[PDB]
Amino acid sequence: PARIAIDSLSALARGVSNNAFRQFVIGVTGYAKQEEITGLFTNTSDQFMGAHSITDSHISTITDTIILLQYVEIRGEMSRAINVFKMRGSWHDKAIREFMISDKGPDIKDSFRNFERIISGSPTRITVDEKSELSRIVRGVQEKGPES
Amino acid sequence: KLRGTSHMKGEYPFTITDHGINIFPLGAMRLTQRSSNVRVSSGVVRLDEMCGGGFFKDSIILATGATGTGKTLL
Amino acid sequence: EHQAIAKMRTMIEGFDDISHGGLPIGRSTLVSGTSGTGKTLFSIQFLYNGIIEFDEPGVFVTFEETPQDIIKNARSFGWDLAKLVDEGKLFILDASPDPEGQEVVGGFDLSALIERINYAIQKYRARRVSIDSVTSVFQQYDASSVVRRELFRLVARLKQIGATTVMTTERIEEYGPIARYGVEEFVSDNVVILRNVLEGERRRRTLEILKLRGTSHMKGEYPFTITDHGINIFPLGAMRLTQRSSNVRVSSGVVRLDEMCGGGFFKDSIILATGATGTGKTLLVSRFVENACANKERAILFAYEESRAQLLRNAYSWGMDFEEMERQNLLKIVCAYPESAGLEDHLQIIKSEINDFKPARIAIDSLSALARGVSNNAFRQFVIGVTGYAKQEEITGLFTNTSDQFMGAHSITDSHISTITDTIILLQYVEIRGEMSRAINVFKMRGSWHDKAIREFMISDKGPDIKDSFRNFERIISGSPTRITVDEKSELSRIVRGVQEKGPES
Amino acid sequence: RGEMSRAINVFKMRGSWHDKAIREFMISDKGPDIKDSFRNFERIISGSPTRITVDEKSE
Ligand SMILES: Nc1ncnc2c1ncn2[C@@H]1O[C@H](COP(=O)(O)OP(=O)(O)OP(=O)(O)O)[C@@H](O)[C@H]1O
Ligand SMILES: Nc1ncnc2c1ncn2[C@@H]1O[C@H](COP(=O)(O)OP(=O)(O)OP(=O)(O)O)[C@@H](O)[C@H]1O
Ligand SMILES: Nc1ncnc2c1ncn2[C@@H]1O[C@H](COP(=O)(O)OP(=O)(O)OP(=O)(O)O)[C@@H](O)[C@H]1O
Ligand SMILES: [Mg+2]
Ligand SMILES: [Mg+2]
């Protein structure tokens, strides 16, 4: 193969000890690496929303690029977000983009610019006067320019 | 032990297959993997953009998220 | 030296510190351990170093190995015993049995042996004696009391003769009785235990001086390694807190940082960079290593997370050409999986390479990676070891730590190395407007003033650009702050309308 | 509001599309009645919401 994907390293960690597991990861990881095979590995975090570490098993240092998916509760609704957490040789986007899933597949929309605490799964929506300043009613300093 | 010379120490896992004993010296693998600047697509264009032009051919990519978030889609 | 007992140096690396001078002269030291622990090697090294450094002839008594084998095997460490046997400095006295023999002979032989060994000692004018595996001799058909008497007889005659002896013994359990018959322990003047402990599929060798009638010594277990140079022991608790301390500064390879650190790092200092995965600890390391080359100084980058190739691709993408540093013979890259060894080994490889390359700067990318698996106490011990070596050697050291949780990390380190370190550089993700920005912070610095700001910074091909602090924010460390505004729009250059040019002209 | 209400959510479904709303629901003798989402609330998931009651754009 040119590419390899393992759907759920996190399912292989079931039972086994962390040290035996880490050993397995380095195993399939370095084999792929020395073989010029691009590999995409999957990890299901044990808790939805609020996850404080990329991986529970602490593999995220043994990896080059990290793609992170997370639920964001927006208005009584469960939406997704995707973020290129890190990429070793490149620049990658720093946005936590919202994204939907359809028959067409994944559509990556925009970031939740007007929110705080997104990482947490339950943001705090927050415009309460958007970036045009409490001077939307622009004072009336402009009461001169126009005349008769 | 091997009186007179050196050797790797410790336990090493192995499997008995149709080709007999197969041992993996997981601690004998060297940190000499080749590294290029060549890119490759994710299967998602917008993703590719976010990653500055695609995943590196020489790379380990990890997709994490809660159950149902769509790792399996990616 | 205030010790009541005259000792003889073994010249085995680290042993004389542990034993507060070497083996008591005129007495015998039991050295016991399981199979493959290094007994035979210790006793050989004892005679060998004795001949090559003090011109003290030696008598080696072998009950199982063959004189050819003892000579063949010593070549592993580059020792030519054959030459010394030749010059009459070393005499191997073959006491092994015959592949063709009978049955019965372990006590008048114990007299035949005494009389024999006295001949050899007398003839070669020997001062050191090693008896290899006395155990195997009564392993003919004996019970505890018979062993205690025979041993005692031998040790005793040897003391009369005036010889300093090393007697080797076997044990079956790593932590059980000291030696087989549970009797040798008390019959010898000094006891040394060689252990080769399992624990998690890795093996760790330790040496312990359990007793030395008459003098003091270091207590407990000490990790050691058998190399091409024989036994090598690290008395990590024998390391003194007398490292030289200067006020001299050095660059980090990042100017803005240097400012932040009130004029760059101290030459004499241990620096720590921690932050979640992806924050850029590796970038800073790269830039700290490169800086010692641009100043024509030698530096070593010990990498435990990235290949030498990858390290290079990535480095080049950040400017800095690692290729050149290599050729110019200013930069040396190591690289190794933490699993490809035990901490002891690792520690020695690092020391080793610092001696062959005499760096002025050293960088360990990810101590936190070396902590994978190992127990915290074994890890802390490793850190004090590499840290302290560097310190007493005037070598500036930059160590990396990846924190297990991005954002919201409540302690600088999960392993609590935070007191062992002089300067702490802290990297973190800040969620600002649906986006992950980074922030850098000089958390502490021992002899300087350093900036207290948590500056935001970007990473480009040019490398790290350190911008400004997030003044109008609260809950920064939390990782996802709250923006509050007494201002923001306040000056800095308001004067609206047409303030820019575009690409054409300006 | 000082009361313990319920909510239901189709957290995930592998082949389908399912609704992503966290819908309030009651239980009677008739069984389960699924009403509407808590659109004007924050931290629902946490169990202890905060209704937004935004002073709109406030003109
Ligand atoms: N045809 C579809 N149309 C819209 N959404 C879909 C469709 N199929 C699946 N989905 C959505 O995508 C999710 C499936 O996730 P996916 O199979 O990608 O793997 P995962 O989340 O990484 O891991 P796991 O399924 O084990 O939890 C569902 O929970 C659902 O919300
Ligand atoms: N050059 C070398 N480099 C590293 N290790 C070596 C080298 N030569 C030998 N060794 C190691 O040292 C060990 C030698 O043990 P040694 O012969 O000293 O006696 P022993 O283990 O105490 O007793 P026994 O006679 O039961 O084997 C070998 O097991 C091997 O692992
Ligand atoms: N050329 C580049 N241009 C812009 N950003 C880059 C470039 N190269 C790397 N980066 C950024 O720097 C990050 C790499 O982190 P770095 O190699 O410094 O080590 P780390 O964060 O300390 O440790 P680790 O990589 O093991 O997690 C990437 O995730 C990315 O955001
Ligand atoms: Mg799945
Ligand atoms: Mg790194």
Side-chain angles (χ1 to χ4, degrees), chain C residues 81 161 229 266 341 352 360 365 458:
Chain C
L81 309 181
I161 307 302
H229 294 310
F266 277 114
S352 163
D365 207 354
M458 55 121 263

Side-chain angles (χ1 to χ4, degrees), chain C residues 119-166:
Chain C
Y119 184 88
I121 288 171
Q122 259 193 59
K123 176 180 175 171
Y124 293 80
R125 275 177 273 158
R127 305 309 266 57
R128 300 187 185 206
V129 173
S130 285
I131 298 162
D132 210 8
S133 57
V134 316
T135 309
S136 59
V137 74
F138 0 80
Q139 264 271 303
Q140 278 206 313
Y141 43 31
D142 301 82
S144 73
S145 54
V146 198
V147 179
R148 180 165 214 154
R149 259 181 288 117
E150 301 295 0
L151 263 203
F152 182 71
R153 175 188 304 164
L154 180 58
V155 163
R157 283 288 291 90
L158 276 161
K159 203 177 248 137
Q160 302 176 333
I161 307 302
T164 311
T165 313
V166 156

Side-chain angles (χ1 to χ4, degrees), chain C residues 277-298:
Chain C
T277 185
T279 51
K281 284 96 62 199
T282 315
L283 173 53
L284 291 183
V285 149
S286 291
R287 200 82 142 203
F288 170 83
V289 131
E290 176 229 49
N291 184 289
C293 298
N295 277 298
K296 300 181 178 181
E297 302 174 302
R298 286 192 173 182

Side-chain angles (χ1 to χ4, degrees), chain A residues 3 38 41 65 69 71 92-93, chain B residues 41 50 57 61-64:
Chain A
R3 290 178 186 200
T38 310
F41 309 81
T65 299
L69 309 177
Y71 293 122
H92 88 89
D93 182 16
Chain B
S41 187
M50 289 166 83
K57 172 172 156 290
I61 329 286
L62 163 79
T64 351

Side-chain angles (χ1 to χ4, degrees), chain A residues 19 22-23 26 30 33 51-54 58 60-62 64 66 83 85-86 88-89 92 94-96 111-113 115-119 131, chain C residues 201 277-278 305-307 310 313-314 317-318 337 339 372-373 402 404-407 429 431 433-436 438 475 480-483 488-489:
Chain A
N19 293 332
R22 254 169 172 182
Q23 207 193 74
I26 309 292
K33 252 181 160 190
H52 264 316
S53 60
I54 276 64
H58 316 311
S60 66
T61 66
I62 284 71
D64 296 308
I66 300 170
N83 164 61
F85 200 73
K86 81 159 178 180
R88 269 160 175 179
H92 88 89
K94 325 295 171 172
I96 307 160
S111 79
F112 307 83
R113 190 186 321 82
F115 288 89
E116 277 191 339
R117 310 202 203 100
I118 267 115
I119 277 311
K131 202 71 190 66
Chain C
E201 311 206 329
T277 185
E305 299 179 315
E306 304 188 68
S307 95
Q310 204 187 321
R313 167 191 84 183
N314 294 0
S317 307
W318 280 321
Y337 282 111
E339 296 60 51
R372 288 186 218 163
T402 284
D404 268 337
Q405 75 178 61
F406 63 108
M407 306 200 18
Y429 289 117
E431 173 200 323
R433 287 155 171 167
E435 290 185 57
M436 306 258 91
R438 295 89 191 300
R475 294 181 56 239
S480 39
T482 288
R483 8 289 194 182
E488 92 87 6
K489 166 65 181 147

Side-chain angles (χ1 to χ4, degrees), chain C residues 40 44 60 62 65-74 81 92:
Chain C
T40 319
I44 288 297
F60 187 92
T62 176
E65 275 171 79
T66 236
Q68 352 315 288
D69 287 331
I70 289 117
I71 296 163
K72 185 54 160 178
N73 289 338
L81 309 181
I92 298 162

